[PDB]
Amino acid sequence: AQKPVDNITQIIGGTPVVKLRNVVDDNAADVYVKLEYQNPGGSVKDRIALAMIEKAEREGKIKPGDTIVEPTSGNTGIGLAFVCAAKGYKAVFTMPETMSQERRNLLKAYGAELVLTPGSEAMKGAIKKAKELKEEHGYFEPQQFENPANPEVHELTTGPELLQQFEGKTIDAFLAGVGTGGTLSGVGKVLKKEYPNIEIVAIEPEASPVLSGGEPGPHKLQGLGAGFIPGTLNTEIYDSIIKVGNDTAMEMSRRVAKEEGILAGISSGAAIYAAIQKAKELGKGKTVVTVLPSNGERYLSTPLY
């Protein structure tokens, strides 16, 4: 157990890794999952929320008490709300009015302010409004799809944690769902350096396969499928792409909760499905690693559970 800390943000990171036992066969590679929902705010996005705020503070762009703005309906808003409460900042989020009352309650429980934009305008409307608010009011915008501190924190923390966790082992393939691409890009850089024969695999929704060259579309893999290629994604880092359908991802998340006792979100079921497909290709004795971004408790009101 960690010695006492003065601020909850000092416990972000250092997340555990579990080997899967039942949803993958003894004929396939070993599959390991990094539990990023064990971060204190509940998802991988604690890491980038802390990193973007700390970099802007270190560059003098913000100081405690300042207000930030970000267009987000997902885990990054929860992450930024959590970090801003812990570090003494004020957070404003823009988002379409289709966001659940419970999700709103979570951001407001950390003290954030919400600015709801027209549902018919989806994320475009929220992005437009956040830029308007930034220019009118002087708010700092973290900009999770452009800020280099996003992939950099994964290069400094998440990736090197994996190198410590797998010392004396070879990772043969690392797979990650792409939302901002920061996880895949920063972890992948660190793992490719240490394990030059590793395969790095991007995961995206079948229904919006923009990295594969297809057109954006509506999909249900929350946390993935931005519909564009983010600034924070290194499109050279991955050797291949695995597309996952809505239903396939949800069926795997249900299997993993019941058969491994690991209760994770939709994007985690997509990651595990892809990792098992890759493990079958690599066969016995090899090592496949992926990341579970968020916990199934955040999805109890969705079709997943």
């Binding site: 309906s73 994320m123 475009k124 901002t180 509506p218 946390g223 993935l224 519909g227």
Partner: peptide
């Protein structure tokens, strides 16, 4: 739309 997306939830990120």
């Amino acid at each position: 739309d997306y939830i990120i």
